[PDB]
Amino acid sequence: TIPHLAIDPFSLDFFDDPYPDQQTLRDAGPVVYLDKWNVYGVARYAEVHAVLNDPTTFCSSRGVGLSDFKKEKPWRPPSLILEADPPAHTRPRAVLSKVLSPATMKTIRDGFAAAADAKVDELLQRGCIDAIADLAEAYPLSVFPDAMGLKQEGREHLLPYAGLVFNAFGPPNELRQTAIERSAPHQAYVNEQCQRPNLAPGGFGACIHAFTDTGEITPDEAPLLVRSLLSAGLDTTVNGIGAAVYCLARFPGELQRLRSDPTLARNAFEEAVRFESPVQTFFRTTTREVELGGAVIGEGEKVLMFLGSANRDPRRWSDPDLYDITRKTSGHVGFGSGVHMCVGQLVARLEGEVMLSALARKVAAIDIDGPVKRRFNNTLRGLESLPVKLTPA
């Protein structure tokens, strides 16, 4: 009853252009079986949303990558939040929610905005830049490690560590094997920075450790929760901001609308998150036999959720392949949905908003003026190099 497909959603050919294969996955049926990796797949909005919002049946504690923690050893100690189910998930989640809370955004917004304005000013002096290394990477590197409270030395490990984390959600292909092979110095750096004495006062890391006396987390839980922010907090925003600049470079009509009303900056970023879906996929594991669509999935099966496909499903979205900065984006699953929905979404949106605001106010044109190069990762979608000419307003 369930169609079997040979599509490999973790192949370089798929990463290079996923959209035809994602339509094939959607149109084959509400639930597919991917023979390449022996997992179920859901690529329509409806089933992705349903799976995300039933954490009891579609659990996370057996891993949200291909590997089943009941069968294989995790490559690193499980995340106390991402790779936990209720009730164990609940108090670590509440702590990170308060650490990255609406009130916390007020303390960092002025500095994040000034750094975004300063970066665009700097880039406009050069004119021809790489919007990945010089903007999408450079701006988050200029605000997020400091907001964490990290020392300066060793920050070159942060993007490699995150690339490793997101590759390690994938199947055991070359991208994953190579990442793990090179992982030891990056894990050593990251694990050391998670310890309380190495996190500067007032930053996100110190605030996590400060929550260890409320009864929500114990002291021995704080390093792994810092680890979660050092895993998820930087590379995601790099590819979110890169996606937004890539969209504005490809759709100049939308750059023109954004210039005319810079208060569209926040929704222009949100639409970029829907349109590119920097985090493409996550897995769940069934805790029981379950009916989904019309298929009966057995217990202990991996289910691959295509977040990017769900965000382009024409059953849910009008003109899904169009970048529209005034679109009603509410309900997109680029940040997830339900109990695990991105706890750092306010940081991500703040960074994206203030960068797009700086562009909206300072830049008249963004023209691709060099070869575009894609960056390949088992979970992240984004570019390696995006040469652009910035024309000042």
Ligand X SMILES: Cc1ccc(C(=O)O)cc1
Told to check if 309 binds ligand X by CB under 6 A, we report no
The CA R_g of the chain, rounded to the nearest whole Å, is: 20
* Neighbouring residues of 122: CB distance < 8 A, sequence distance ≥ 6: none
Furthest CA-CA distance within the chain: 60
C-alpha to C-alpha distance for 34 and 42, rounded to whole angstroms: 10
Told to check if 236 binds ligand HEM by CB under 6 A, we report yes
**Binder of ligand X out of 81, 226, 295, 305 (CB under 6 A):** 81
Residue 335 interacts with, from ligand X, Cl ion, ligand HEM, none (CB under 5-8 Å by kind): ligand HEM
Residue 389 Cβ vs ligand HEM, minimum distance, rounded to whole Å: 25
Q: Is 85 exposed, middle or buried (0-12, 13-18, 19+ CB in 10 A)?
A: middle
DSSP string for 141-185: HHHHHHHHT--STTGGGHHHHHHHHHHHTS-SSHHHHHHHHT-HH
Strand bridging mode 302-306 / 39-42: parallel
Told to check if 82 binds ligand HEM by CB under 6 A, we report yes
Residue 187 interacts with, from ligand X, ligand HEM, Cl ion, none (CB under 5-8 Å by kind): Cl ion
**Per-residue contact string for residues 185-204; x = within reach of Cl ion by CB under 5 A:** --x-----------------
Residue 241 Cβ vs ligand X, minimum distance, rounded to whole Å: 16
Told to check if 194 binds ligand HEM by CB under 6 A, we report no
Residue 165 interacts with, from Cl ion, ligand X, ligand HEM, none (CB under 5-8 Å by kind): ligand X
Structure-token pair, residue 83? 């790779």
Q: Which backbone phi and psi does 59 adopt, to 5 degrees?
A: -85, 165
- Among 355, 374, 372, smallest CA distance to 123 is for 355
Q: What distance lies between CA 205 and its chain's CA centroid? A: 20
**Binder of ligand HEM out of 48, 116, 194, 342 (CB under 6 A):** 342
Which residues does the annotation place in the binding site? 89, 93, 284, 340, 342
For 160, other C-beta atoms within 10 Å of its C-beta total: 17
Told to check if 209 binds Cl ion by CB under 5 A, we report no
Residue 348 interacts with, from ligand X, Cl ion, ligand HEM, none (CB under 5-8 Å by kind): ligand HEM
**Binder of ligand X out of 232, 244, 264, 297 (CB under 6 A):** 232
Residue 231 Cβ vs ligand HEM, minimum distance, rounded to whole Å: 8
Contact present, 313 and 261 (Cβ < 8 Å): no
Closer residue to Cl ion in complex, CB, 76/176: 76
Which residues on neighbouring strands pair with residue 368, listed in sequence order? 388
Closer residue to Cl ion in complex, CB, 194/305: 194
Residue 336 interacts with, from Cl ion, ligand HEM, ligand X, none (CB under 5-8 Å by kind): ligand HEM
Residue nearest to ligand HEM (CB): 344
Choose one: 52-60, 77-85, 97-105, 177-185; the region binding ligand X (CB under 6 A).
Answer: 77-85
- Among 349, 343, 347, smallest CA distance to 97 is for 343
Closer residue to Cl ion in complex, CB, 189/246: 189
Residues 67-126 interacting with Cl ion (rule: CB under 5 A): 76
Q: Which amino acid is at 69?
A: F
**Binder of ligand HEM out of 176, 186, 209, 340 (CB under 6 A):** 340
Q: Which backbone phi and psi does 304 adopt, to 5 degrees?
A: -90, 120
Closer residue to ligand X in complex, CB, 165/217: 165
Structure-token pair, residue 167? 């590759």
Told to check if 378 binds ligand X by CB under 6 A, we report no
Helix/strand/coil for 54: coil
Cα 189–Cα 191–Cα 194 angle in degrees, nearest 5: 110
Contact present, 302 and 39 (Cβ < 8 Å): yes
Contact present, 280 and 274 (Cβ < 8 Å): no
Told to check if 207 binds ligand X by CB under 6 A, we report no
C-alpha to C-alpha distance for 288 and 298, rounded to whole angstroms: 6
Binding site for ligand X (CB under 6 A): 79, 81-82, 165, 228, 231-232, 279
Binding site for ligand HEM (CB under 6 A): 60, 64, 81-82, 93, 96, 100, 228-229, 232-233, 236-237, 240, 273, 278-279, 282, 307, 334-336, 340, 342-344, 347-348
